[PDB]
Amino acid sequence: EQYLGNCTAYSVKGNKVVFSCANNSKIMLQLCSGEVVKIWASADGNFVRNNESFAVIEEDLGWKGNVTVKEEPSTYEIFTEQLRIRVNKAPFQLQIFDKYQKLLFSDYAEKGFVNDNGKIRTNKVLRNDEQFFGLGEKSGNLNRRGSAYKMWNSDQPCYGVNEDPLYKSIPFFMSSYRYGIFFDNTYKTEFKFGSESNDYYSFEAPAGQMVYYFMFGNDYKEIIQNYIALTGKPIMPPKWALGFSQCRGDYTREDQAREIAAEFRKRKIPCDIIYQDIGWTEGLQDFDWRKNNYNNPKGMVKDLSDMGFKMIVSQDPVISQANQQQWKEADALGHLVKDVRTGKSYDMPWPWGGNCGVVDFTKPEVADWWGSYQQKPLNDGVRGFWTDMGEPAWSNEDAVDRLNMKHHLGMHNEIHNVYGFTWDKVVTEQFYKHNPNKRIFQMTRAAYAGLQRYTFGWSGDSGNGSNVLDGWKQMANQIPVGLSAGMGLIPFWTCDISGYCGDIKDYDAMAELYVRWLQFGVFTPLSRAHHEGGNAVEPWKFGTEAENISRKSIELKYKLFPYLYTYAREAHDTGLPIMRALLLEYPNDKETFKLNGQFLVGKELLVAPVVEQGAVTKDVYLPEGEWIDFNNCKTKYKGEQWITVDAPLNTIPVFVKKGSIIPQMPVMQYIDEKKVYPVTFDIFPGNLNKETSFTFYEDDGESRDYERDVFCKTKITSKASNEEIKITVGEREYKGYSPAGPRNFILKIHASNKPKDVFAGGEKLKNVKPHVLEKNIEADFTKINWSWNEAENVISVRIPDSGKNAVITIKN
Ligand SMILES: OC[C@H]1O[C@H](OC[C@H]2O[C@H](O)[C@H](O)[C@@H](O)[C@@H]2O)[C@H](O)[C@@H](O)[C@@H]1O
Numbered sequence: 028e029q030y031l032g033n034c035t036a037y038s039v040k041g042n043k044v045v046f047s048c049a050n051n052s053k054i055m056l057q058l059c060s061g062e063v064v065k066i067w068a069s070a071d072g073n074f075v076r077n078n079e080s081f082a083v084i085e086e087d088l089g090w091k092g093n094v095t096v097k098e099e100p101s102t103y104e105i106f107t108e109q110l111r112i113r114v115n116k117a118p119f120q121l122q123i124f125d126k127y128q129k130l131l132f133s134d135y136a137e138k139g140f141v142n143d144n145g146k147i148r149t150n151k152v153l154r155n156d157e158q159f160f161g162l163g164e165k166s167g168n169l170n171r172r173g174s175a176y177k178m179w180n181s182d183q184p185c186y187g188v189n190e191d192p193l194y195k196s197i198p199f200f201m202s203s204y205r206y207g208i209f210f211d212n213t214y215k216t217e218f219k220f221g222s223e224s225n226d227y228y229s230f231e232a233p234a235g236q237m238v239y240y241f242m243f244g245n246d247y248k249e250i251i252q253n254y255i256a257l258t259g260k261p262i263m264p265p266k267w268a269l270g271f272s273q274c275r276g277d278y279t280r281e282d283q284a285r286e287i288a289a290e291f292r293k294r295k296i297p298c299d300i301i302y303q304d305i306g307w308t309e310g311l312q313d314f315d316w317r318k319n320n321y322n323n324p325k326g327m328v329k330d331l332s333d334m335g336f337k338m339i340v341s342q343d344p345v346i347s348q349a350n351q352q353q354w355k356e357a358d359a360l361g362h363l364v365k366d367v368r369t370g371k372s373y374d375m376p377w378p379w380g381g382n383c384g385v386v387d388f389t390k391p392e393v394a395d396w397w398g399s400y401q402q403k404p405l406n407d408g409v410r411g412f413w414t415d416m417g418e419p420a421w422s423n424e425d426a427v428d429r430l431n432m433k434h435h436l437g438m439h440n441e442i443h444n445v446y447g448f449t450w451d452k453v454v455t456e457q458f459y460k461h462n463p464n465k466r467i468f469q470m471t472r473a474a475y476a477g478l479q480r481y482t483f484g485w486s487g488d489s490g491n492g493s494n495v496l497d498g499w500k501q502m503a504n505q506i507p508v509g510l511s512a513g514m515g516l517i518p519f520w521t522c523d524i525s526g527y528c529g530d531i532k533d534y535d536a537m538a539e540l541y542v543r544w545l546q547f548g549v550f551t552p553l554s555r556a557h558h559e560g561g562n563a564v565e566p567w568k569f570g571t572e573a574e575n576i577s578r579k580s581i582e583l584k585y586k587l588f589p590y591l592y593t594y595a596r597e598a599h600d601t602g603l604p605i606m607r608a609l610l611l612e613y614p615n616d617k618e619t620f621k622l623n624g625q626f627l628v629g630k631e632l633l634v635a636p637v638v639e640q641g642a643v644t645k646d647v648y649l650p651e652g653e654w655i656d657f658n659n660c661k662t663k664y665k666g667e668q669w670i671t672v673d674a675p676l677n678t679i680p681v682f683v684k685k686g687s688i689i690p691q692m693p694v695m696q697y698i699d700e701k702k703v704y705p706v707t708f709d710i711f712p713g714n715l716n717k718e719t720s721f722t723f724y725e726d727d728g729e730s731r732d733y734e735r736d737v738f739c740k741t742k743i744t745s746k747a748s749n750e751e752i753k754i755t756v757g758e759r760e761y762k763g764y765s766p767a768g769p770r771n772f773i774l775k776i777h778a779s780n781k782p783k784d785v786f787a788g789g790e791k792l793k794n795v796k797p798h799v800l801e802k803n804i805e806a807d808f809t810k811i812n813w814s815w816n817e818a819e820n821v822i823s824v825r826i827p828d829s830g831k832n833a834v835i836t837i838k839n
Pocket residue numbers: 275276277304305306379415416472487488527558559560561
């Protein structure tokens with residue numbers, strides 16, 4: 028094996044420095060910014076790659092001028108605002124320190140880069156206290172330290188708690204030394220976080236180029252912000268995507284879709300999306316509504332739309348040989364992935380429809396061809412897709428025949444991990460071209476780093492196939508799977524609520540597991556119930572008790588829409604997921620590294636779902652601050668402690684941090700059932716003299732205008748003093764969008780005693796009964812008054828949403 032060995036020279040060209048080492052080997056450092064360093068180690072010195080990065084869309088992160096290299100007798104030095112880079116000459120060793128001279132990231136001995144006949148590996152020093160997170164949508168515990176992980180998009184139905192690889196390959200991880208690494212290589216990469224030794228960790232590839240980005244941060248937020256500078260801001264879904272979604276393996280016909288739509292509304296179980304699974308299409312993949320299953324597809328879509336339902340249909344990336352017309356067409360055009368052994372279209376087995384041709388989404392001409400096909404259901408009013416089986420399916424590591432696939436942009440060993448990525452990119456690009464200035468809804472199974480630009484994600488075929496009732500640990504592991512997905516830039520994520528796998532032979536017996544799964548699931552942004560085949564899993568299938576609990580769970584998510592939607596926008600701006608591992612907000616608290624049974628939803632809410640069978644309590648870790656039971660709003664706990672709370676089947680443990688302001692809307696059956704509505708702000712005042720706030724974000728919810736920063740914002744602020752609370756409704760920030768109106772705001776201040784008075788500016792407000800304050804809340808926008816609820820310990824102040832600054836002073 029080949030190492031870099033001694034560095035004999037360097038050359039600078041703009042923001043790039045190239046170090047020449049032994050036997051034509053070279054290594055480049057490129058300062059994308061003061062915090063982000065692109066590193067390219069090369070065994071032969073050439074700096075070429077078969078394909079430029081599929082993930083990176085910007086290398087200019089604001090570095091000004093040349094890189095300055097200071098040569099010393101045995102080292103070179105490069106300084107930035109945040110980094111001190113030390114390069115050993117003999118042998119070459121890259122060492123990155125922070126500005127306090129603490130070592131962050133160092134080559135291990137002389138083996139920082141190792142080439143072994145095309146196999147490329149990077150070895151770094153590993154410290155005893157160094158922990159690791161990320162690598163995208165992967166199983167096991169959040170903390171990756173001690174384990175090894177592989178990138179090969181795989182199709183492993185009913186997967187276990189530690190199964191790896193899974194469906195998506197996002198080679199971005201973060202260290203608790205507060206740097207991220209993105210390994211910009213699409214081959215079957217492997218990450219070994221002290222699984223071989225305590226002295227080093229490694230990342231490697233069997234072929235391709237050793238290109239990776241070192242991303243400094245003072246916290247994890249800063250690292251993630253740097254990663255989206257490189258790989259793109261997440262697109263936001265249409266606003267209605269944050270409601271509840273329903274699917275089934277057999278959701279493939281008109282009469283059923285109409286019946287299901289009617290059942291949700293009759294039962295007052297809120298729901299926005301009805302999915303249709305792959306049987307909807309006549310053949311793979313013609314996008315024609317199956318004749319025996321749909322009589323009037325346009326009328327169906329329109330009638331569901333009038334009921335507030337949006338439809339999302341499946342697509343696979345293959346053309347069945349039995350679909351002779353479309354197969355012959357694709358094959359004649361050269362649009363199918365070839366077999367290197369024959370020069371002809373690769374003959375791919377598939378689980379339905381027979382052998383198929385794999386569509387080559389890396390061939391440029393395929394994009395418009397596919398776009399015209401997929402547009403058909405969209406012309407009927409369908410609002411988007413779920414892109415399934417893009418691994419490609421049935422192409423796990425052991426299916427070595429697949430390595431003979433030759434795609435336009437490369438061989439399968441390179442392209443496998445971006446097969447689904449490039450497909451999903453075509454789907455979104457073509458949607459944009461055919462449906463201008465509209466947000467796509469795409470939710471995908473298979474993906475690569477950078478997917479956030481084109482698609483959302485679900486975690487595929489989860490749960491227990493042998494016995495559905497024994498899926499508790501698998502359900503529980505969807506928490507860190509989702510949180511890790513979030514850290515890999517899948518902010519808009521869900522899992523199959525109820526799991527995918529396992530026949531439901533006994534609905535009474537499955538009720539408890541279904542309820543707990545849905546309680547967790549409604550805190551995923553794209554909450555979707557789904558199950559294999561004809562295993563119905565609508566929230567009324569498990570008896571009245573489970574139905575009532577499930578309706579309440581869904582209702583809570585809908586009430587939280589304005590809160591969740593604000594965090595949807597924060598995902599676009601910062602890269603932060605809605606579902607946040609506590610470590611992202613409390614990086615100084617090492618206890619957070621172990622938390623696989625709870626998470627934050629935005630910053631203000633801590634959710635701790637019960638994920639153990641028979642459990643009627645929950646152990647919850649509370650980080651810094653004081654924390655209030657969000658279910659009753661009375662019980663308060665001190666932070667930095669483990670507690671045990673009561674958590675029977677009808678309860679989801681949810682906590683709100685003291686200081687929080689939570690925007691909520693009324694219960695509706697779908698997002699924008701009421702196009703205008705009063706907004707309530709639940710205010711839990713912080714400690715004496717501490718100013719807290721929430722910035723309520725609004726936009727049109729449908730167009731791409733938000734990408735050009737067309738929106739409005741209303742900042743609500745709270746500051747408690749000695750026997751006085753000041754609530755400020757900030758002047759509306761208008762950036763080209765104005766909200767639904769006219770409407771009222773209701774400030775709901777949680778407090779132990781009725782106050783003496785409430786003022787709006789200098790004017791004293793009339794105290795009124797709750798019924799008066801509530802009367803004509805959607806009809807009269809000239810009333811300013813306040814009420815007191817002794818039972819709930821809430822001061823309610825009604826105020827028209829004028830868009831003007833107002834200071835509300837509560838006198839205790
Ligand atoms: O009609 C074919 C097939 O349709 C459903 O399954 C599609 C299935 O594909 C992957 O496993 C995804 O990960 C799942 O979310 C999809 O539901 C039915 O479940 C099946 O019974 C049927 O044969």
